Each structure stands twice: as structure tokens, then as C-alpha cells.
Amino acid sequence: THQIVTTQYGKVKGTTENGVHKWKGIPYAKPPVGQWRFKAPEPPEVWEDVLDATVYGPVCPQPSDLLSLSYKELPRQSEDCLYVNVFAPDTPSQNLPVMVWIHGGAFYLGAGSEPLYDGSKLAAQGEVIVVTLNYRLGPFGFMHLSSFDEAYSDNLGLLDQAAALKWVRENISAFGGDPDNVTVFGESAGGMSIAALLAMPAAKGLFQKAIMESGASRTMTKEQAASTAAAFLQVLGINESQLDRLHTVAAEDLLKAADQLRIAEKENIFQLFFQPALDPKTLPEEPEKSIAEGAASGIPLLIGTTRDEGYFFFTPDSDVYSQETLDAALEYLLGKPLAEKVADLYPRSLESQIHMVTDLLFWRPAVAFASAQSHYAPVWMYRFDWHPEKPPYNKAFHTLELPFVFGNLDELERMAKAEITDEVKQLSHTIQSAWTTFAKTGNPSTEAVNWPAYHEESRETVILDSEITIENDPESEKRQKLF
Ligand SMILES: [Ca+2]
């Protein structure tokens, strides 16, 4: 019971708290620092001593937008951030299902070790193993320089994720898990990453089930990636023959360059500058397209969105984008033809701006992904409607279902100043129960909810809220409009 586990790279020593074995800060790759910056993740150097796995590793460098809110104590940052954490219920039973979390944060923020993602409650209550992890963010993970050198790899953050999943397949049995029953789950950028992992050749067979919360197919073209890379190099004063400084410049300077780039190219929510990109060697094509071809055949999918996603990105006092920028967004998201047809739906205003986020950045991609996958595997869809009744947090906004999934309800205080009522504890119980039953069986049905299979003929959807309900082909009008 002293919890020493041998990984393929060396022994790690965990701890046991309240019936949950925990190992924090386990290296799964070589620190992508200096000369290893912008390169695919490599195995970490082996160690023959006994690594103390009781403290979280550093988080990837990022502006403090999210850290200063998610932590009461700002965590240490460093490009040396590739670590995984394992939470396992103290049970005699071995080969427990494994749930691997990929955190969100629009590809430039977050960490697997945010308090919100502590997997103790989820592990104990669902009797599954929970794995959390960090992957390169912003310019460290979603700055694609392949066009400047075949030695560099694009979609680094996604390759990091794939490497962590490979680590799980190769090592989790040692922690009491079943490497053949791995469920990957994530929200926001994590859901979008899972969309990509489902379509990435180098991720084949790394997981058997998937949960995509508020996030589906999301990529920029190969052309845009090259365009943004050149623009980025300029801000750094680096050119085709000075690619040396890329491996010597301080990480802190890469973050500044990124923010300047953000400002220079006037980045807006509809087209993030750092996100996955098409690339023959890593992400051959749009996830949605690959899935429609059956690339994820046989893999059960639990997918959904929150009813009021957009209200998380804009406050009542937020500036309203110009027509010029709005048209450019609609056109980029739906294409010239559909953009014009739907222009009607979004007449300039804060309202339309927000509805554009919910509808085009989350709902439409979700329905498109669920619909496509329904021809090759079981699909289960939901819409999260819960929210405090009284203002100003009376909207089912992006991120709000997270405390319920993980059961860390204290987070609801900072997220929506909501108290933990029996109503809240009950919704969390139903959600955790469905998520863990799905990880165990590939079907999220539980005594609390009999989840109907989602297919294009009826599009039955489960509505998560104080009272569970089922809607058939929700928002039919809009769907028919957007499709
Ligand atoms: Ca022991």
C-alpha cells in the first residue's frame, strides 16, 4: 500500500487520501525546451531512483487570464510542463475503466492540474481511474512552422496529447487500469482536440470511447497556418535564415510576440490565431470530414453543448464587432453562399454576436459531428440548460457544466456565485453517473436517465437540468437553416 508504481521510464511513488490513490507530476515526455521547442514530443530520459509523484508539474506558459481565476495561488509556469496525474479509487478490483481528461482554454490557456479538474471525486464515485495532463499551448503548441522546416512539427499540442494517451496505454495497467477501455473526454479546446485526435492517424487505437463537451471540429487551413507563422516570425525579427533564435529566445518573449500578433492581426473569437491546422503529417483533413468517412468507426461518442454558450464570451458592456468583421466571420464559418442566406439570422448587435458564438462555434459543429458519427458508432447527445435563475449568471454558459462533471461543486462559487443546493448536487450526481457509466459501457443510461441513441432520423437529445427531459430534433428551424 505504499503506492510505488513502475512506469516504462522509472518508478513513481504516490499517496492515498480519502480512499483515492493519487500520483501527480509524472513525466510523459522530454521537456520541450530549447532545441526541442517546435519539435514532436520525445520520451523522457529514464530514471532509476524513485520519483516523488506528490506534487503537480509546472503548467505551460500563458497570459494569466485563466490562472488568476482558477487558482487561489498562481502555479509555476514553464515549457517544462508535460506531465500526467493519476487518480484511482482504493479498490481491490483491477482493470478499471480509464477516463483521460483534455482541458479547454481556447488553445492558449489552462492546465490539467487546475483545481476544477481534481479527479478524486469522479474516481471514487464512478469507480474509474481519472487521468489529467498538460499539453503545449499558444505559440508553444499551436504555432505551425512545418512550412519553414520539415524538421518542425505542426499541431504540437495535439501530438503532446497523443503522447500522453500512448503513455496511458503503455502504463495505466500498472496503476490498476484497463488500457483497452480508455475514454477520452474534454471541454472547449479539449473537445475540439478530441475531434482532431479522432481523425489523426498517429492516434489510432489510443482510446475506445469519447466525450466531447462544447467543442467539435475546429481547424485553420494549411495556408492560414503558414501565413500566421510568417507573421509571427516577423514580430520576432526572425527570417528564413535565422531560425536559430527560435530555440534560444526566452519563452516569455514568445508570449509577448503572440499577444502583439493577436493585436496586430486583430484576432476575434471567430478565428483564433492559435488552433489546430490541416497538415498532411499530423492532421490530414477536417475532423468532421474524416469522421463522415468512418475514420472513427466503432467508437461510441457522448457529445453536447450548453444552451447559452456565447454568454461566457461577452458581457452586456462588450464592444460590438463591425459589420465588416461580422460578415468576414459568417463567411469564414459558413462560406459565401450560406453566409448570405443566414445573414438574416444575425443582424448586427450584441445579441447576434453572442448567438453567432453559440450557434456557429459550438452548436452547429456539434450537430454536424454527432450526425456524421451516427453512421459508424453509437452517438448520445445532450444540451445543458441549467443556470441560476436570478441575474447576472442566469444563462447556461460555456464552462458551466464542468463543476457538475467533476463533482467539484465549490467551483460554482467563482463561476456563477451559485450555492450548492440539493438541486445542484442532484444534477451533478446524474451527470457524473452518466459519464462514468458511459466510460464503462458505451451507453450513458442510468436510473436517472434512459438516454436515447442519436441518429439523423429523429435526433433525440437529452436535456440536462434540475429536471431531466428529452427533446426530439431540438431547434429544427435553425438546424434546417444552418444545414
Ligand atoms: Ca505498498
Closest listed residue to residue 140, CA positions, set 274, 266, 278: 274
Expressed in angstroms and rounded, the spacing between residue 134 Cα and the centre of ligand 1 is 28
Expressed in angstroms and rounded, the spacing between residue 3 Cα and the centre of ligand 1 is 5
Report the interhelical angle of 222-236 vs 251-264 (nearest 10°). 120
Expressed in angstroms and rounded, the spacing between residue 84 Cα and the centre of ligand 1 is 21
Expressed in angstroms and rounded, the spacing between residue 269 Cα and the centre of ligand 1 is 50
Expressed in angstroms and rounded, the spacing between residue 45 Cα and the centre of ligand 1 is 25
CB atoms within 5 A of ion ligand 1 belong to: 1-2
Catalytic residue among 188, 214, 290, 433: 188
Alpha-carbon distance of 244 to 13, in angstroms, equals 39
Query: What CATH number is attached to the domain comprising 197?
Result: 3.40.50.1820
398 catalytic? Reply is yes
Which residues form the domain of 44? Answer: 1-483
Alpha-carbon distance of 84 to 15, in angstroms, equals 15
Q: What angle do CA 418, 420, 422 make, to 5 degrees?
A: 130
Question: For the chain, what is the domain count?
Answer: 1
* Residue 464 DSSP SS3: strand
Q: How was this structure determined?
A: X-ray
Q: Are 229 and 279 in contact (CB under 8 A)?
A: no
309 catalytic? Reply is yes
Catalytic residue among 187, 398, 411, 428: 398
User: Which residue's entry shows cell 453566409?
Assistant: 339
Catalytic residue among 114, 309, 401, 411: 309
Residue 186 grid coordinates: 474534454
Expressed in angstroms and rounded, the spacing between residue 4 Cα and the centre of ligand 1 is 7
* Residue 4 DSSP SS3: strand
Expressed in angstroms and rounded, the spacing between residue 444 Cα and the centre of ligand 1 is 35
